[PDB]
Write an enzyme that holds these catalytic residues in place. Structure first.
Site, PDB file in Angstrom:
ATOM      1  N   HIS A 111       0.938  -1.253  -0.084  1.00 32.30           N
ATOM      2  CA  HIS A 111       0.033   0.124  -0.078  1.00 32.30           C
ATOM      3  C   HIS A 111       0.872   1.190  -0.096  1.00 32.30           C
ATOM      4  O   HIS A 111       2.163   1.351   0.349  1.00 32.30           O
ATOM      5  CB  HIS A 111      -1.001   0.138   1.302  1.00 32.30           C
ATOM      6  CG  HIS A 111      -0.193  -0.034   2.479  1.00 32.30           C
ATOM      7  ND1 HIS A 111       0.550   0.900   2.674  1.00 32.30           N
ATOM      8  CD2 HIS A 111      -0.178  -1.004   3.516  1.00 32.30           C
ATOM      9  CE1 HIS A 111       0.849   0.694   4.231  1.00 32.30           C
ATOM     10  NE2 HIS A 111       0.729  -0.578   4.477  1.00 32.30           N
ATOM     11  N   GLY A 112       0.244   2.280  -0.192  1.00 28.26           N
ATOM     12  CA  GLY A 112       1.126   3.508  -0.291  1.00 28.26           C
ATOM     13  C   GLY A 112       1.493   4.218   1.051  1.00 28.26           C
ATOM     14  O   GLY A 112       1.170   3.615   1.828  1.00 28.26           O
TER      15      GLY A 112
ATOM     16  N   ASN B 268       3.551   6.164   8.104  1.00 32.96           N
ATOM     17  CA  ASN B 268       4.961   5.937   7.675  1.00 32.96           C
ATOM     18  C   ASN B 268       5.491   7.240   7.288  1.00 32.96           C
ATOM     19  O   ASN B 268       6.744   7.417   7.400  1.00 32.96           O
ATOM     20  CB  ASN B 268       4.694   5.209   6.296  1.00 32.96           C
ATOM     21  CG  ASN B 268       5.799   4.733   5.636  1.00 32.96           C
ATOM     22  OD1 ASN B 268       6.361   5.199   4.571  1.00 32.96           O
ATOM     23  ND2 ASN B 268       6.433   3.742   6.252  1.00 32.96           N
TER      24      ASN B 268
ATOM     25  N   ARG C 197      -5.284   1.932   5.056  1.00 33.06           N
ATOM     26  CA  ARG C 197      -4.468   2.346   4.261  1.00 33.06           C
ATOM     27  C   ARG C 197      -4.191   0.913   3.107  1.00 33.06           C
ATOM     28  O   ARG C 197      -4.132   1.274   1.986  1.00 33.06           O
ATOM     29  CB  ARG C 197      -3.057   2.370   4.921  1.00 33.06           C
ATOM     30  CG  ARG C 197      -2.583   1.185   5.713  1.00 33.06           C
ATOM     31  CD  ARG C 197      -1.511   1.830   6.626  1.00 33.06           C
ATOM     32  NE  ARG C 197      -0.592   0.486   7.323  1.00 33.06           N
ATOM     33  CZ  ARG C 197      -0.864   0.133   8.676  1.00 33.06           C
ATOM     34  NH1 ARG C 197      -2.163   0.653   9.281  1.00 33.06           N
ATOM     35  NH2 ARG C 197       0.039  -0.684   8.930  1.00 33.06           N
TER      36      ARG C 197
ATOM     37  N   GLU D 277      -1.216  -6.072   9.376  1.00 35.51           N
ATOM     38  CA  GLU D 277       0.321  -5.883   9.685  1.00 35.51           C
ATOM     39  C   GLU D 277       0.345  -6.455  11.028  1.00 35.51           C
ATOM     40  O   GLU D 277      -0.519  -6.639  11.834  1.00 35.51           O
ATOM     41  CB  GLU D 277       0.701  -4.348   9.752  1.00 35.51           C
ATOM     42  CG  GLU D 277       1.935  -4.019  10.227  1.00 35.51           C
ATOM     43  CD  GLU D 277       3.183  -4.737   9.243  1.00 35.51           C
ATOM     44  OE1 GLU D 277       3.859  -3.845   8.638  1.00 35.51           O
ATOM     45  OE2 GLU D 277       3.355  -5.880   9.181  1.00 35.51           O
TER      46      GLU D 277
ATOM     47  N   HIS E 212       0.615  -6.603  15.023  1.00 31.06           N
ATOM     48  CA  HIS E 212       0.416  -5.825  16.227  1.00 31.06           C
ATOM     49  C   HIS E 212       1.410  -5.503  17.129  1.00 31.06           C
ATOM     50  O   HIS E 212       2.047  -6.326  17.719  1.00 31.06           O
ATOM     51  CB  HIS E 212      -0.636  -6.476  17.109  1.00 31.06           C
ATOM     52  CG  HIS E 212      -1.412  -5.666  18.080  1.00 31.06           C
ATOM     53  ND1 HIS E 212      -0.646  -5.094  19.279  1.00 31.06           N
ATOM     54  CD2 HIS E 212      -2.477  -5.156  18.354  1.00 31.06           C
ATOM     55  CE1 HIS E 212      -1.479  -4.353  19.760  1.00 31.06           C
ATOM     56  NE2 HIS E 212      -2.600  -4.489  19.323  1.00 31.06           N
TER      57      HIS E 212
ATOM     58  N   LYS F 161      10.186   5.243  15.166  1.00 25.05           N
ATOM     59  CA  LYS F 161      11.149   4.046  14.972  1.00 25.05           C
ATOM     60  C   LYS F 161      12.453   4.338  15.277  1.00 25.05           C
ATOM     61  O   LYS F 161      13.349   3.186  14.971  1.00 25.05           O
ATOM     62  CB  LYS F 161      10.986   3.758  13.459  1.00 25.05           C
ATOM     63  CG  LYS F 161       9.294   3.674  12.660  1.00 25.05           C
ATOM     64  CD  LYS F 161       9.273   2.970  11.336  1.00 25.05           C
ATOM     65  CE  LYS F 161       8.168   3.123  10.839  1.00 25.05           C
ATOM     66  NZ  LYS F 161       8.266   2.486   9.490  1.00 25.05           N
TER      67      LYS F 161
ATOM     68  N   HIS G 268       0.481  -5.399   3.481  1.00 20.58           N
ATOM     69  CA  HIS G 268       1.326  -4.621   4.497  1.00 20.58           C
ATOM     70  C   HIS G 268       2.989  -5.535   4.032  1.00 20.58           C
ATOM     71  O   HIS G 268       2.835  -6.326   3.680  1.00 20.58           O
ATOM     72  CB  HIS G 268       1.217  -4.563   5.857  1.00 20.58           C
ATOM     73  CG  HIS G 268      -0.316  -4.154   6.084  1.00 20.58           C
ATOM     74  ND1 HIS G 268      -0.577  -2.834   6.146  1.00 20.58           N
ATOM     75  CD2 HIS G 268      -1.132  -4.781   6.006  1.00 20.58           C
ATOM     76  CE1 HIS G 268      -1.996  -2.746   6.350  1.00 20.58           C
ATOM     77  NE2 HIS G 268      -2.485  -3.991   6.496  1.00 20.58           N
ATOM     78  N   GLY G 269       4.080  -4.348   4.507  1.00 21.39           N
ATOM     79  CA  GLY G 269       5.310  -4.778   4.210  1.00 21.39           C
ATOM     80  C   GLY G 269       5.773  -6.247   4.697  1.00 21.39           C
ATOM     81  O   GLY G 269       6.249  -7.097   3.915  1.00 21.39           O
TER      82      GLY G 269
END
Lengths: 235, 235
Positions: free
Chosen positions: B14-15, B20, B65, B92, B94, B103, B186-187
């Site tokens: 997703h964008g 992010n 997202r 994604e 949790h 981060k 998600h990544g």
């Protein structure tokens, strides 16, 4: 405080489309929302949110003006995660030859007696798409449809003949299980569903005025799927 | 001309989301796309359209997202009518306590040895949400979830433990029937799916670079669900 019904069905007319703005019949033609139609969808979403609706599932046709309205409404409601189902059997009438025509030329095409049936009843069937006319059912999205179920010119009665089995088989069972269901519908489909649920006749239905874009009907049912109340909520 | 595979699975990240952009962990926190993230979704839609993809079904998580990216992509592809399915098991990780943190603070929270496991492996489990911390799983959208399946702090391994059954039970059978499937992921979910399909180990996976927002993996399968090819297509 108020008593909540066992189940609820909200039927919302989609926002203004380009064909609606041009005053041209669309039917299965896949005309998209205008800028105003998109704002109609946001306004309808705010309308449903102020009434506190939390839906378990949403239904739409295969037509973009219905689907896009559904997505916008769920965006406003913060319910983008809920089950959404799109099915061609909830499509507007396939207008056949009338597809793409100005809604005023039909006075020329139709005799005066025929025009009376068109507005006062639901049994008048438009002729099929002409040779060389762009037929919306030729779109690749309908490639999995059996050719024998594909309509070419539908009266409102014929449209309801194909939509009613889907309503009874997919939507009613969820209402009977206490679900809150949203349907983003086309004008004629909403009118047919209202006639069925309220047990009206064709003449009474066409006597009633058409709901504006973004207006919604709210049907409330008990646990035996008896109709308890119909409300009209509008911006 | 080229030979089409029996089935195809496209996984698209997703964008860009607001978390992010802020460089803060989101996990189950329901951060929405930014303006750039929305343009990422449109660009990914144009990317898939130029490759000629026509999907039979699309999957997303419960997170906005992912869902919003899916809707935009289908809008560009002119496939808004196709079956879309959203399920929390594709969510994604949790992140528990780490939810909402920068981060960069995790270097403080984690020892140097712990940081090595965080980046080079997939077994490190974040601690649960602190008392008084806004826990994303408390959102009403998860009210129908059994409390015993609701995670509070998930390693990538734990996330894949709950996502893998859904992948095998809902997505794989459609690929085995010759369907073309889109997943807006998600990544970490995309990385886990790539490791499973390609039969990698945890160390090789984390050695590979992360795909940028809007980049996509294309897996092609024959009729026995053997992996024939993996392509990376990007804007």
């Amino acid at each position: 405080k108020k008593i909540e019904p066992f189940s609820t069905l909200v039927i919302l007319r989609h926002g203004e489309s380009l064909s609606n703005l041009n005053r041209t019949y669309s039917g299965w033609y896949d005309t998209d929302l205008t800028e105003k139609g998109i704002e109609d969808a946001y306004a309808a979403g705010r309308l449903l949110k102020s009434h506190g609706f939390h839906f378990d599932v949403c239904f739409s046709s295969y037509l973009k003006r219905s689907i896009r309205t559904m997505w916008i409404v769920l965006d406003v409601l913060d319910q983008m995660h809920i089950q959404t189902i799109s099915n061609w059997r909830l499509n507007e009438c396939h207008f056949g030859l009338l597809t793409g025509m100005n809604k005023e030329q039909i006075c020329t095409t139709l005799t005066e007696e025929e025009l009376n049936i068109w507005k006062k009843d639901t049994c008048l069937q438009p002729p099929p798409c002409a040779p060389g006319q762009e037929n919306p059912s030729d779109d690749p999205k309908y490639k999995d449809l059996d050719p024998r179920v594909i309509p070419n010119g539908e009266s409102i009665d014929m449209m309801w003949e194909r939509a009613k089995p889907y309503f009874i088989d997919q939507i009613v069972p969820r209402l009977m299980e206490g679900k809150k269901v949203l349907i983003v519908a086309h004008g004629n489909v909403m009118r047919a569903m209202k006639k069925y649920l309220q047990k009206m006749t064709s003449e009474e239905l066409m006597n009633e005025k058409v709901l504006s874009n973004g207006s919604a009907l709210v049907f409330k049912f008990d646990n035996k799927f008896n109709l308890l109340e119909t409300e009209i909520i509008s911006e």
